[PDB]
Amino acid sequence: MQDAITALINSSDVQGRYLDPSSLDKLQNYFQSGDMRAKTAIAVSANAKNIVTKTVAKSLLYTDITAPGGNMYTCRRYAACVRDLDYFLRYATYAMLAGDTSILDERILNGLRETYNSLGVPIGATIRSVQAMKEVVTSLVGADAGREMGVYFDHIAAGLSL
Amino acid sequence: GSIVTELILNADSESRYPAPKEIQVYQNFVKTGEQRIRIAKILAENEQRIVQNGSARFWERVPNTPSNSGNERKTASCQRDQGWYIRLIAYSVLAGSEKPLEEIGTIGIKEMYNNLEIPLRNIVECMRCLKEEALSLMSEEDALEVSAYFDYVMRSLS
Numbered sequence: 491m492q493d494a495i496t497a498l499i500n501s502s503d504v505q506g507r508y509l510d511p512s513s514l515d516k517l518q519n520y521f522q523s524g525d526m527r528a529k530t531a532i533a534v535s536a537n538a539k540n541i542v543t544k545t546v547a548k549s550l551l552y553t554d555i556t557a558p559g560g561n562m563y564t565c566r567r568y569a570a571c572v573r574d575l576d577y578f579l580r581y582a583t584y585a586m587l588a589g590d591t592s593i594l595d596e597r598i599l600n601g602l603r604e605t606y607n608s609l610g611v612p613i614g615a616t617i618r619s620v621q622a623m624k625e626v627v628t629s630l631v632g633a634d635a636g637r638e639m640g641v642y643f644d645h646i647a648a649g650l651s652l
Numbered sequence: 653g654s655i656v657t658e659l660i661l662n663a664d665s666e667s668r669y670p671a672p673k674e675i676q677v678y679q680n681f682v683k684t685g686e687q688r689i690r691i692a693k694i695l696a697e698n699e700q701r702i703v704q705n706g707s708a709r710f711w712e713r714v715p716n717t718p719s720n721s722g723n724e725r726k727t728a729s730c731q732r733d734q735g736w737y738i739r740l741i742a743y744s745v746l747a748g749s750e751k752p753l754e755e756i757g758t759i760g761i762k763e764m765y766n767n768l769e770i771p772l773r774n775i776v777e778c779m780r781c782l783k784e785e786a787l788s789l790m791s792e793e794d795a796l797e798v799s800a801y802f803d804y805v806m807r808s809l810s
């Protein structure tokens with residue numbers, strides 16, 4: 491995968507150059523954000539199961555998707571869904587820590603639009619639930635860190651629209 | 653990749669969040685950021701000095717070598733490579749790992765140089781010369797990190 495540092499290294503390396511004044515210090519920017527990033531990852535790690543519970547409650551329950559014939563009907567399918575929300579949360583945290591979205595493109599969104607449509611998984615409902623996760627997490631970590639995790643959530647949501 | 657990438661990919665392989673140990677590594681790493689950037693700046697501004705002074709000691713140490721055969725191009729080529737290894741080492745220092753150096757410079761090194769018909773031990777030698785120059789431009793502490801990266805390149809060439 492690529493991180494905030496790896497990315498800057500790679501953009502330099504393709505022009506055969508040492509890191510430039512702006513690539514440096516963007517690096518300083520990152521190194522300074524680590525504490526907040528470690529703080530956020532720790533808190534999400536300890537509220538992971540709780541976050542998805544609130545997420546599901548606010549976007550997927552009491553709808554046509556949990557009714558017979560719905561894509562979230564059948565405990566198996568309900569559990570699959572919750573597992574996918576588990577994946578979005580964990581991977582968005584990896585990304586936030588890395589300070590780069592690349593890991594989402596390669597480990598989460600690779601063939602997901604395609605896989606979902608194949609299985610009948612409602613894409614608009616999924617986006618809805620990702621935007622709820624955003625808010626639930628912001629309610630747990632504050633707006634300051636909430637914006638940061640927001641960017642990664644927005645990324646996932648955006649890559650399902652296409 | 654980088655130290656951060658290694659931590660994340662570790663957790664990924666166990667399908668879990670970062671552990672207490674992985675978080676502490678991360679915190680100790682980013683804490684040394686300013687110093688790391690100081691080191692990489694040294695290397696950047698002293699590329700020509702290191703290369704030319706190291707080339708100079710190197711060629712005295714090893715006169716039979718394809719960069720010292722009265723062939724420009726060949727000489728130019730070798731001088732360019734030395735500069736590239738400095739760049740890679742600088743990236744590694746910033747990354748907190750030999751990953752940048754490994755991916756860009758180390759994996760395939762024997763196959764490439766062998767193909768080019770450049771004796772490996774001579775490259776190792778030149779690395780010693782470059783190593784010395786760079787160490788001298790910097791503090792005792794700063795020298796520790798940088799030493800190992802130079803050592804790494806030399807490890808891979810034998």
Ligand SMILES: *[C@H](C)[C@H]1/C(=C/c2[nH]c(/C=C3N=C(/C=C4\NC(=O)C(CC)=C4C)C(C)=C\3CCC(=O)O)c(CCC(=O)O)c2C)NC(=O)[C@@H]1C
Pocket residue numbers: 550555561562567568570571572574575577597598602605609611612615616619
């Ligand atoms: C929950 C918010 C929504 C929902 C989810 C849903 N997903 C599946 C099926 C799959 N989900 C994935 C996704 C991934 N697998 C991975 O390893 C990764 C990367 C870490 C991702 C993102 C895949 C590949 C599948 C297929 C395999 C499987 O079935 O387990 C289901 C099951 C659908 C079915 O018909 O079997 C469901 C229910 N569904 C909803 O209604 C929500 C909107």
Ligand SMILES: *[C@H](C)[C@H]1/C(=C/c2[nH]c(/C=C3N=C(/C=C4\NC(=O)C(CC)=C4C)C(C)=C\3CCC(=O)O)c(CCC(=O)O)c2C)NC(=O)[C@@H]1C
Pocket residue numbers: 717718719720725726727729730731733734736756757768770771774775778
């Ligand atoms: C210098 C210390 C030694 C030396 C080297 C030597 N190099 C060349 C030619 C090339 N070297 C490279 C190397 C790289 N390609 C990469 O991707 C990387 C990693 C980032 C490196 C370091 C390449 C590709 C070339 C080929 C020319 C080109 O750039 O297209 C030569 C010339 C060989 C020739 O026959 O032309 C030499 C001599 N020679 C010495 O004496 C030292 C031990």
Ligand SMILES: [K+]
Pocket residue numbers: 536537538539540541
């Ligand atoms: K919990």
Ligand SMILES: [K+]
Pocket residue numbers: 758759760761762763
């Ligand atoms: K090799």
